[PDB]
C-alpha cells in the first residue's frame, strides 16, 4: 500500500492529497482507483503499466491538460472512467478514447469539451452511459448525430450545456432510455418556429426525459405530442410555467410520473387530469397553488401519490377530495395555509401509507378540529412529521375535544 493512500480490499483511494503525479507502488492487484481532488496535469507514459486489473478509474477534480488516446494504453480493461471537473478544453471527435474498448460508463462532466461532432465516441462501441453535463463553454461542433451511432447507449446527460441555438434539429436513437436535458435552453428552442418541434421525437424507446431548469414559460401541446410515445417520466421542475394544459397529458399515453415542482402554477385548474391517463405520481409541490378545481384528480384511476407540499393551499374541498384522492398511497399537504379540514374526509383512505400535514396553521379550537384530532390520533403511524396547532405549539394529535 502506497503512502498518502487508503487501501481497502482491491479498492484504492488517494483523494485530496495535493498530488502532482500518480503514487508509485499501487498494488498491481487493484480493481478500483481514485485520484480525486489533486493537482494532476499529466498521465506520463507507462504510469498505469502494472495496473492491469483496473476496471474503475476516477481522475475527478484535477487539472488534466489534454485527453490523448495513448494516456489509456494498458487501461483497456476499464469499465468506468471519470475525468470530471478537470476543465479540459479540447475537441472530441472519435480519436480520444481509442484503447478503451471495454468502457461502459464515461463521465466527462464539468469540462470545456467541444463534443458535438458526428464521429465523437465512435471509438467506444460498448458505451452504455455517458455524462457530458456542464460543458457549456466548449473550446465548435454543432452535430448530435454521434449519439445515433452508439447502439448500446442507454443513458445520456447533456445537462447545463447552454444548448439553445445552431444544433441538430433532431436527436435520434433506438437505445437511450434516459435523457437528462436539464439546465439548457429548450424554452428558446421551442420558441424558434418549428425548428426544434421534433427534437426528441427520434429517441425511440425513451423512458425518462428531464427538462427541468429550461426557462420554460409556456408549453405548446404539439411539443408534448412530439415527445417519444414510450415516455414514462417527464420532469419540468424549476421552470416558469404559470399555466398547464392538463388535457395535453393525453398526448403522453404511457406517462406515469409528472414532475411540475418549482413552477408558478396558481391553482390546479384549466381542465382536469384526462380520461385514460396512466399517471401514478404527480409532483406539483413548490408552486403557488391556492385552490384545486372540483374532480381534478377524479378519473386518474392509477394515481398513487400527489405532492401538494409548499404551496398556499387555503382549503381542502370535498369537490376535489374525490375518490381518486381518497385512494392515494401518499399525500403531501404540508407547508400550506390550511386551518381546518372537512369532517370525515380522511375516512376511506384505504391505501394510505403516508400523509403530510405539518407547517399548516391548524385551528385547534374544539368543536372544529375534533375529527382531525381524533383521526391523527388513530392514524399516528401514517403521519409524517407532525401537524401543530397555530395558537400553541401542541401537536394536533394531542387535542382531546369533549
Ligand atoms: C480531433 O481533436 C483533436 C484534439 O482532441 C485535434 O487535435 C484534431 O485536430 C481533431 N481532428 C479533427 C478531425 O478535426
Ligand atoms: C452531422 O453530420 C452528419 C454526417 O455528415 C450529417 O449527415 C449531418 O447533416 C450533420 N448535422 C449537422 C447539424 O450539421
Ligand atoms: C389544451 O390543449 C388542447 C390540445 O391538446 C387544445 O385543443 C385546447 O384548446 C387547449 N386548452 C387551452 C385552454 O389552452
Ligand atoms: C385558467 O383558469 C383561469 C380561471 O380560473 C383563467 O383566468 C385563465 O385564463 C385560464 N387559462 C386559460 C389559458 O384559459
Ligand atoms: C414533496 O415536495 C417537497 C419539496 O417541494 C419534498 O420535501 C418532498 O420530498 C416531497 N415529498 C415526497 C414524499 O417525495
Q: How was this structure determined?
A: X-ray
In the structure grid, which three cell numbers stand for residue 31, read together? 480493481
Phi, psi of 372 (to 5 degrees): -65, -40
HEC per residue, the chain:
CCCCCEEECCEEECCCCCCCCCCCCCCCCCCEEECCCCCCCCCCCCCCCCCCCCCEEECCCCCCCCCCHHHHCCCCCCCEEECCCCCCCCECCCCCCCCCCCCCEEECCCCCCECCCCCCCCCCCCCCEEECCCCCCCCCCCCCCHHHHCCCCCEEECCCCCCCCCCCCCCEECCCCEEECCCCCHHHHHHCCCCCCCCCCEECCCCEEECCCCCCCCCCHHHHHCCCCCCCEEECCCCCCCCCCHHHHHHCCCCCEEECCCCCCCCECCCCCCCCCCCCEEECCCCCCCCECCCCCCCCCCCCEEECCCCCCCCCCCCCCCCCHHHCCEEECCCCCCCCCCCCCCCCCCCCCEEECCCCCECCCHHHHHHHHHHHHHCCCCEECCCEECCCCCEHHHCCCC
Residues framing ligand 3 (Cβ under 6 A): 221, 245, 247-248, 270
116 C-alpha to ligand 2 centroid (Å): 10
Give, for ligand 2, the residue of 120, 121, 145, 146 to mutate: max count of ligand atoms closer than 8 Å to Cβ: 145
d(CA 76, CA 69): 11
In the chain, where the domains are located: 1-402
- Hey, CA dihedral for 34, 134, 229, 260, is it positive or negative? positive
Alpha-carbon distances of 315 from 80, 312, 334, rounded to whole Å: 51, 9, 12
- Give the atom of ligand 2 at the shortest distance from the alpha carbon of 167: 13
Contact 267, 289 (CB under 8 A): yes
Pairing of strands 155-157, 129-131: parallel
d(CA 321, CA 173): 42
Ligand nearest to the CA of 90: 1
234 C-alpha to ligand 3 centroid (Å): 19
Based on C-alpha coordinates, what's the Rg of the chain? Answer: 26
In the structure grid, which three cell numbers stand for residue 67, read together? 485527453
- Give the atom of ligand 5 at the shortest distance from the alpha carbon of 354: 13
Amino acid at each position: 500500500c502506497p503512502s498518502r493512500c487508503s487501501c481497502s480490499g482491491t479498492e484504492i483511494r488517494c483523494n485530496s492529497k495535493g498530488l502532482t503525479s500518480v503514487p508509485t507502488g499501487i498494488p498491481s492487484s487493484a480493481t478500483r482507483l481514485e485520484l480525486e481532488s489533486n493537482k494532476l496535469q499529466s498521465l506520463p507514459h507507462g504510469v498505469f503499466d502494472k495496473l492491469t486489473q483496473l476496471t474503475k478509474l476516477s481522475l475527478s477534480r484535477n487539472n488534466l491538460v489534454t485527453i490523448k488516446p495513448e494516456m489509456f494504453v494498458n487501461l483497456s480493461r476499464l469499465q468506468c472512467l471519470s475525468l470530471s471537473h478537470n476543465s479540459i478544453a479540447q475537441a472530441v471527435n472519435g480519436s480520444q478514447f481509442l484503447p478503451l474498448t471495454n468502457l461502459q460508463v464515461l463521465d466527462l462532466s464539468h469540462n470545456k469539451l467541444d463534443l458535438y461532432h458526428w464521429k465523437s465516441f465512435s471509438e467506444l462501441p460498448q458505451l452504455q452511459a455517458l455524462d457530458l453535463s456542464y460543458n457549456s463553454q466548449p473550446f465548435i461542433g454543432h452535430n448530435f448525430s454521434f449519439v445515433t451511432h452508439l447502439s448500446m447507449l442507454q443513458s445520456l446527460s447533456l445537462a447545463h450545456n447552454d444548448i439553445h441555438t445552431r444544433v441538430s434539429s433532431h436527436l435520434n436513437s433506438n437505445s437511450v432510455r434516459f435523457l437528462d436535458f436539464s439546465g439548457n435552453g429548450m424554452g428558446r428552442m421551442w420558441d424558434e418556429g418549428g425548428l426544434y418541434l421534433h427534437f426528441f421525437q427520434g429517441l425511440s424507446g425513451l423512458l425518462k426525459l428531464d427538462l427541468s431548469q429550461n426557462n420554460l414559460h409556456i408549453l405548446r401541446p404539439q411539443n408534448l405530442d412530439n415527445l417519444p410515445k414510450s415516455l414514462k417520466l417527464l420532469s419540468l421542475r424549476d421552470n416558469y410555467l404559470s399555466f398547464f394544459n392538463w388535457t395535453s397529458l393525453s398526448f403522453l399515453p404511457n406517462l406515469e410520473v409528472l414532475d411540475l415542482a418549482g413552477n408558478q402554477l396558481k391553482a390546479l385548474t384549466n381542465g382536469t387530469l384526462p380520461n385514460g391517463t396512466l399517471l401514478q405520481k404527480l409532483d406539483v409541490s413548490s408552486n403557488s397553488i391556492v385552490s384545486v378545481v372540483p374532480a381534478f384528480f377524479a378519473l386518474a384511476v392509477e394515481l398513487k401519490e400527489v405532492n401538494l407540499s409548499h404551496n398556499i393551499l387555503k382549503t381542502v374541498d370535498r369537490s376535489w377530495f374525490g375518490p381518486i384522492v381518497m385512494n392515494l398511497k401518499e399525500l403531501a399537504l404540508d407547508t400550506n395555509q390550511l386551518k381546518s379540514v372537512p369532517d370525515g374526509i380522511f375516512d376511506r383512505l384505504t391505501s394510505l401509507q403516508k400523509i403530510w400535514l405539518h407547517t399548516n396553521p391548524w385551528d385547534c379550537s374544539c368543536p372544529r378540529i375534533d375529527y382531525l384530532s381524533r383521526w391523527l390520533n388513530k392514524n399516528s403511524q401514517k403521519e409524517q412529521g407532525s401537524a401543530k396547532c397555530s395558537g400553541s405549539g401542541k401537536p394536533v394529535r394531542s387535542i382531546i375535544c369533549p
